Amino acid sequence: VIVTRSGAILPKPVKMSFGLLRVFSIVIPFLYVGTLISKNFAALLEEHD
Amino acid sequence: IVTRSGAILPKPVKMSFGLLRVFSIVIPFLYVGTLISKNFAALLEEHDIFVPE
Amino acid sequence: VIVTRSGAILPKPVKMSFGLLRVFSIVIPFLYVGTLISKNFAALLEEHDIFVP
Amino acid sequence: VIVTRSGAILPKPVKMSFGLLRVFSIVIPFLYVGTLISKNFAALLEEH
Amino acid sequence: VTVVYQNGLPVISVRLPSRRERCQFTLKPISDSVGVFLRQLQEEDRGIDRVAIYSPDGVRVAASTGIDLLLLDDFKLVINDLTYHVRPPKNDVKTLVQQLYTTLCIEQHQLNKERELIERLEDLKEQLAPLEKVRIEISRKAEKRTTLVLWGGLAYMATQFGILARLTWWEYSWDIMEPVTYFITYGSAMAMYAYFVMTRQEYVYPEARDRQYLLFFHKGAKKSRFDLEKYNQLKDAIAQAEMDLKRLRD
Amino acid sequence: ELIERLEDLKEQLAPLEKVRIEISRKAEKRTTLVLWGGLAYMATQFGILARLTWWEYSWDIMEPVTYFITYGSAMAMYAYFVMTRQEYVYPEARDRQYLLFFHKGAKKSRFDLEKYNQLKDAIAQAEMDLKRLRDPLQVHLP
Amino acid sequence: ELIERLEDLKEQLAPLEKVRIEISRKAEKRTTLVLWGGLAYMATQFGILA
Amino acid sequence: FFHKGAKKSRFDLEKYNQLKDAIAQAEMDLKRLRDPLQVHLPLRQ
Amino acid sequence: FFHKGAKKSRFDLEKYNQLKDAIAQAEMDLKRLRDPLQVH
Amino acid sequence: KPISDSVGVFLRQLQEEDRGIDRVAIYSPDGVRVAASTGIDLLLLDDFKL
């Protein structure tokens, strides 16, 4: 896998530039969206029965 | 997705309204499940095999 | 998968000869082995005061 | 696979030497250092 | 009319006049000829007042020619009155003497090319060995780093098991720590999906190990300033020479 | 000449194949014993936990026990990837275990694996050449 | 000779392919039934727990 | 399910898959014969 | 999504992936004709 | 077809195309007779007395 049948070595595979901080910058605010929607669903659940 | 020659695969085949038939088979059997769960709960609530406390 | 590259149909995939009997006849007595080695182990812990309750 | 295309049985599979001993020499002390920082974190967390 | 070999069989669908059926006639191209076709046409019904096949020039074609010769062109289908212009859908000495010329001069050409190819093989082995010496050392260092990454992953697993193990049995309750010990598993699932979407590559352990091995190998070849393009160029060249020398074994 | 040579090589193949069948059914019975023993452990764990949930303990006693058993086996499969360089996949692990038993049994019984394997290679390599020489399209034979 | 033999084998296919298509559809319908029955087992095991 | 249905209808299948292998053999032979009759270059295994 | 965009913009995908097979076949045949082993 | 047919196949086709024919032959530009198994392309090298 690391070595082709010829004996060559595969090139450096593609890494998404700044993709790790893209994941970190999409997980955190959508976690805050989950934070907001937990309260704003539990409150209207308990208060309007 | 791309073959050896550089060509492109045919269309990914779908089915005859898959979402509707999946929903129409998952929901009534869910109702049959909750019905037979209630029926089994009553059936061994009649005898002394149950355990709610 | 279903057919060969040629379109010929594969031979019948073999089931185990009386396999469904031979599996549950090893499952259930070893469930009893797990019964026995646990009812001995709980008594061994009850004897020497290492047990939790 | 077990045989190759020609009926050629594949050779003896590579093991690493003392590998069960090497993993047993590594699972234990890292579990113990997790125990150690467990003590360090538990005595300090609700202390603040 | 329609002659459709979508089945592989060119099947004419045709009618005679005063007939109920637009009758379909299946025919082989090469063995079914006009004669046995008219045998089929005369056993199918009774419209054998006159029936034939004419040329586009109007000449009567042979009654024993193959339909493969017929359907290569259009024709006049002959019934007693009307005319179907049926439309179906659809040097040599030099090649022989060139094969003859090369047949005289294969063996000396192969015997020359064998020496030439062994010369190229030997010269490229000479050109490949001193780069191979640096490649082995860089591969050893990258393998050491990836092996320590494997053992550090096992270290992470054992340390996580220890910190989860101590609190539940000696300090805290299982009832107040089971959510955290679930969310570590759900975070591991999110991390697997993050490795997939980050790398366009499925998180399985040999492929992840080889991923980190290649990244450490090209980091080491960059830091030791290795000529990787020369190295795998010469590996490809020697592999091609070995394939050609395998071709010369007959 | 080619068919006499290939039958000579089959003749040399003839005893070693029977020896390989004997050692192969031995190693196959051993790896089937290993498979049924894995099923045995898979059963007796469930029997142990079947007792320890209701019969003499509670669920909140053994719930972290089951949790750490599953997490420990999830870690142990990674340990299997550390030991040999392949993931714990059932036909793949069965192939490794069977072939390891094969080489153990061939080391004990001491028959030529290499003279089996080289010669079994030469069987198919000469048979491909006979197949190409008997081509109905590349006329050599009348 | 080969394009003769190909159409000979095509005509020898021609009666038996229909019986094969019948058996194939007849078993494929049962496989669809057992797939939807697996999903039925899954939905019922969800519901009796819920 | 297929071998079940075929044994229920007593479907002869050795003739079927032998026929399909012969047809695939013929088509591979035509695909090899594509070379010398159009490109006029030598053949393979 | 690519077949959706294909049905949208209507760019003869059948001609394209036929022509890819044709150009790969002809390219392999030319490399076959440029054998370093046989006089051509 | 010149690559597949001999003279005898063409002559039997010419024979069966009618019925009122009994004697057929293909002669040379000279008086001699071209046989039945002779290839058509060898006959189409030159003219011939039919």
Phi, psi of B27 (to 5 degrees): -80, -45
What does the angle CA E82 – CA E84 – CA E89 come to, to the nearest 5 degrees? Answer: 175
Say whether residue J13 is in contact with chain E using an 8 A CB cutoff.
Answer: yes
* Pick among C2, C12, C14 to test the H interface (most H CBs inside 10 A): C12
- Using CA atoms, how far residue D36 sits from D32, E157, E160, E167, F59, in Å, is 6, 15, 12, 11, 29
Return the residue matching tokens 């360089």.
F85
Size of interface E-G (CB pairs under 8 A): 10
Among positive and negative, which fits the CA dihedral E122, E126, E131, E136? Answer: positive
Q: What is the distance of C-alpha E144 from the center of its chain?
A: 38
The pair of structure tokens assigned to A10 is 């595969």
CB spacing of E161 vs F75 below 8 angstroms:
yes
**Gap positions in chain H, given as the residue before each gap (C–N > 2.5 A)?**
none
Among positive and negative, which fits the CA dihedral D22, D25, D28, D33? Answer: negative
Question: Which residues does chain D have within 8 Å of residue E159's beta carbon, measured at their own beta carbons?
Answer: 30-31, 33-34, 37
Of the candidates E20, E25, E23, the residue with the CA atom closest to the CA atom of residue E9: E25
Q: Which residue of F has its CA nearest to D15?
A: F84
**B29: which residues sit within 8 A by CB, 6+ positions away?**
G40, G43, G44, G47
What does the angle CA C23 – CA C26 – CA C28 come to, to the nearest 5 degrees? Answer: 105
Map residue J39 onto helix, strand or coil. strand
**What's at F90, amino acid-wise?**
Y
Pick from E155, E160, E171: CB nearest D42:
E171
Q: What is the distance of C-alpha B49 from the center of its chain?
A: 30
Pick from B5, B7, B11: CB nearest I3:
B11
Map residue I12 onto helix, strand or coil. coil
Q: Which chains touch J (3 or more CB pairs under 8 A)?
A: E
**F125: which residues sit within 8 A by CB, 6+ positions away?**
D6
H or E, element range at E85: strand E83-85
Q: Which residue of F has its CA nearest to H45?
A: F132
**G50: which residues sit within 8 A by CB, 6+ positions away?**
B30, B33, B34
List the beta bridge partners of residue E12: E3, E25
**F10: which residues sit within 8 A by CB, 6+ positions away?**
F123
Q: What is the CA radius of gyration of chain J?
A: 11
**Whole-angstrom Cα distance, residue E195 to residue H8?**
51
The pair of structure tokens assigned to H2 is 């297929």
Question: Which residues does chain I have within 8 Å of residue B11's beta carbon, measured at their own beta carbons?
Answer: 3
**Whole-angstrom Cα distance, residue F107 to residue F110?**
5
Phi, psi of G31 (to 5 degrees): -70, -35
**Whole-angstrom Cα distance, residue E184 to residue E187?**
5
Sheet of strand E52-54: strand arrangement: E52-54, E76-78, E83-85
Cβ neighbour number for residue E45 with a 10 Å cutoff:
13
List the beta bridge partners of residue E78: E52, E83
Asked if residues E141 and E223 have their Cβ atoms less than 8 Å apart, the reply is no
> Do chains I and B have 3 or more beta-carbon pairs under 8 angstroms?
yes
Asked if residues A8 and E214 have their Cβ atoms less than 8 Å apart, the reply is no
Asked if residues E99 and I40 have their Cβ atoms less than 8 Å apart, the reply is no
Sheet of strand E11-14: strand arrangement: E2-4, E11-14, E23-26
Q: Which residue of C has its CA nearest to H5?
A: C12
Size of interface D-F (CB pairs under 8 A): 46
Q: What is the CA radius of gyration of chain G?
A: 21
Asked if residues B5 and I21 have their Cβ atoms less than 8 Å apart, the reply is yes
Count Cβ neighbours within 10 Å for each residue of C4-42 and write b for 16 or more, e otherwise: eeeebbeeeeeeeeeeeeeeeeebeebbeebbeebeeee
Size of interface C-H (CB pairs under 8 A): 20
The pair of structure tokens assigned to E225 is 């300033």
Please give the annotated binding residues of F, written as ranges.
63
Say whether residue F137 is in contact with chain H using an 8 A CB cutoff.
Answer: yes
CB spacing of A7 vs E200 below 8 angstroms:
no
Q: What is the largest CA-CA distance in chain E?
A: 108
**Whole-angstrom Cα distance, residue C44 to residue C50?**
9
**Whole-angstrom Cα distance, residue A13 to residue A23?**
19
The pair of structure tokens assigned to A3 is 């070595």
DSSP string across E177-246: THHHHHHHHHHHHHHHHHHHHHHTS---HHHHHHHHHHHHHHHHHHHTT--HHHHHHHHHHHHHHHHHHH
The pair of structure tokens assigned to E85 is 């212009």
Q: Which residue of H has its CA nearest to C5?
A: H24
CB spacing of F132 vs H32 below 8 angstroms:
no
Under DSSP, the state recorded for E76 is E
Say whether residue E239 is in contact with chain A using an 8 A CB cutoff.
Answer: yes
Question: Which residues does chain G have within 8 Å of residue H19's beta carbon, measured at their own beta carbons?
Answer: 9, 12-13, 16
**D22: which residues sit within 8 A by CB, 6+ positions away?**
D16
Phi-psi bin for A3: left (phi > 0), alpha (psi -120 to 50), beta?
Answer: beta
For H:3-32, CB contacts with G below 8 A are 4-6, 9, 11-12, 15-16, 19-20, 22-23, 26-27, 29-30
Of the candidates F15, H45, B38, the residue with the CA atom closest to the CA atom of residue E250: H45
**A43: which residues sit within 8 A by CB, 6+ positions away?**
none
Under DSSP, the state recorded for I11 is -
Q: What is the distance of C-alpha G31 from the center of its chain?
A: 8
Map residue H7 onto helix, strand or coil. helix
Q: What is the distance of C-alpha F18 from the center of its chain?
A: 19
Asked if residues E241 and E121 have their Cβ atoms less than 8 Å apart, the reply is yes
Q: What is the distance of C-alpha E209 from the center of its chain?
A: 28
* Pick among C1, C5, C6 to test the H interface (most H CBs inside 10 A): C6
What does the angle CA D30 – CA D33 – CA D38 come to, to the nearest 5 degrees? Answer: 125
Under DSSP, the state recorded for E26 is E
CB spacing of D31 vs E161 below 8 angstroms:
yes
**What's at F63, amino acid-wise?**
E
Phi, psi of D10 (to 5 degrees): -65, 145
Phi, psi of F91 (to 5 degrees): -70, -30
Pick from E200, E218, E228: CB nearest A14:
E200
Please give the annotated binding residues of F for Ca(2+), written as ranges.
63
Question: Which residues does chain D have within 8 Å of residue E151's beta carbon, measured at their own beta carbons?
Answer: 26
Q: What is the distance of C-alpha J21 from the center of its chain?
A: 14
Question: Which residues does chain H have within 8 Å of residue F138's beta carbon, measured at their own beta carbons?
Answer: 43
Asked if residues F96 and F86 have their Cβ atoms less than 8 Å apart, the reply is yes
List the beta bridge partners of residue E60: E54
Asked if residues F78 and E157 have their Cβ atoms less than 8 Å apart, the reply is yes
**Whole-angstrom Cα distance, residue H11 to residue E152?**
60
Return the residue matching tokens 């289908």.
E77
For E:159-178, CB contacts with D below 8 A are 159-163, 165-167, 171-172
Asked if residues E159 and D30 have their Cβ atoms less than 8 Å apart, the reply is yes
What does the angle CA J23 – CA J25 – CA J28 come to, to the nearest 5 degrees? Answer: 155
Asked if residues D37 and E163 have their Cβ atoms less than 8 Å apart, the reply is yes
Among positive and negative, which fits the CA dihedral B28, B30, B32, B34? Answer: negative
**Whole-angstrom Cα distance, residue F23 to residue F30?**
11
**What's at A34, amino acid-wise?**
G
H or E, element range at A27: helix A19-47
Among positive and negative, which fits the CA dihedral E128, E129, E132, E133? Answer: negative
Q: Which residue of I has its CA nearest to B1?
A: I2
**E34: which residues sit within 8 A by CB, 6+ positions away?**
E53, E61, E62, E63, E64, E65, E66, E67, E70
Task: Kindly tell me the burial class for residue C49, based on how many C-beta atoms sit within 10 Å of its own C-beta (0-12, 13-18, 19 or more).
Answer: exposed
CB spacing of G6 vs H15 below 8 angstroms:
no
**Whole-angstrom Cα distance, residue F111 to residue F105?**
10
Asked if residues J26 and J7 have their Cβ atoms less than 8 Å apart, the reply is yes
Method of determination used here: cryo-EM
List the beta bridge partners of residue B2: B8
**Whole-angstrom Cα distance, residue B44 to residue C31?**
25
**Whole-angstrom Cα distance, residue F122 to residue F130?**
12
Map residue A2 onto helix, strand or coil. coil
How far the first Cα of chain B sits from its last, in Å, is: 59
Q: Which residue of E has its CA nearest to A16?
A: E198
Question: Which residues does chain C have within 8 Å of residue F61's beta carbon, measured at their own beta carbons?
Answer: 52-53
Question: Which residues does chain C have within 8 Å of residue H20's beta carbon, measured at their own beta carbons?
Answer: 4, 6-8
Resolution in A: 4.2
DSSP string across chain F: -HHHHHHHHHHHHHHHHHHHHHHHHHHHHHHHHHHHHHHHHHHHHHHHHHIIIIISS-HHHHHHHHHHHHHHHHHHHHHHHHHSSS---HHHHHHHHHHHHHHHHHHHHT--HHHHHHHHHHHHHHHHHHHHHT-TTS----
Asked if residues D14 and F84 have their Cβ atoms less than 8 Å apart, the reply is yes
**What's at A42, amino acid-wise?**
A
Asked if residues F16 and F116 have their Cβ atoms less than 8 Å apart, the reply is yes
Cα distance from J29 to chain E (closest Cα, Å)?
26
Of the candidates I20, I27, I26, the residue with the CA atom closest to the CA atom of residue B2: I20
Of the candidates H33, G3, G12, the residue with the CA atom closest to the CA atom of residue E29: G3
**Whole-angstrom Cα distance, residue E52 to residue E41?**
10
* Pick among C35, C44, C47 to test the F interface (most F CBs inside 10 A): C35
**Whole-angstrom Cα distance, residue F130 to residue F141?**
12
Torsion angle of the four alpha carbons E135, E138, E141, E147, in this order, in degrees rounded to the nearest 10: -60
Q: Which chains touch E (3 or more CB pairs under 8 A)?
A: A, D, F, G, I, J
List the beta bridge partners of residue E26: E11
Question: Which residues does chain H have within 8 Å of residue C12's beta carbon, measured at their own beta carbons?
Answer: 3
Cβ neighbour number for residue B32 with a 10 Å cutoff:
15
**Whole-angstrom Cα distance, residue H42 to residue H32?**
10
Q: Which residue of E has its CA nearest to I38?
A: E106
Please give the annotated binding residues of E for Ca(2+), written as ranges.
178
Pick from H1, H12, H30: CB nearest G27:
H1
Phi, psi of E183 (to 5 degrees): -70, -20
For F:8-47, CB contacts with C below 8 A are 36, 39-40, 43-47
Q: Which residue of F has its CA nearest to C33?
A: F44
User: HSE (CB half, 13 Å, CA atoms) of E183?
Assistant: 4
Cα distance from B48 to chain G (closest Cα, Å)?
20
Say whether residue C7 is in contact with chain H using an 8 A CB cutoff.
Answer: yes
**Whole-angstrom Cα distance, residue H41 to residue H34?**
10
**What's at J4, amino acid-wise?**
S
The pair of structure tokens assigned to E238 is 């020697």
Helix axes F2-50, C19-47, angle to 10 degrees: 40
Q: Which residue of F has its CA nearest to D17?
A: F83
> Do chains I and E have 3 or more beta-carbon pairs under 8 angstroms?
yes
**Whole-angstrom Cα distance, residue D25 to residue D19?**
10
Phi-psi bin for E175: left (phi > 0), alpha (psi -120 to 50), beta?
Answer: alpha
**E144: which residues sit within 8 A by CB, 6+ positions away?**
none
**Whole-angstrom Cα distance, residue E29 to residue E27?**
6
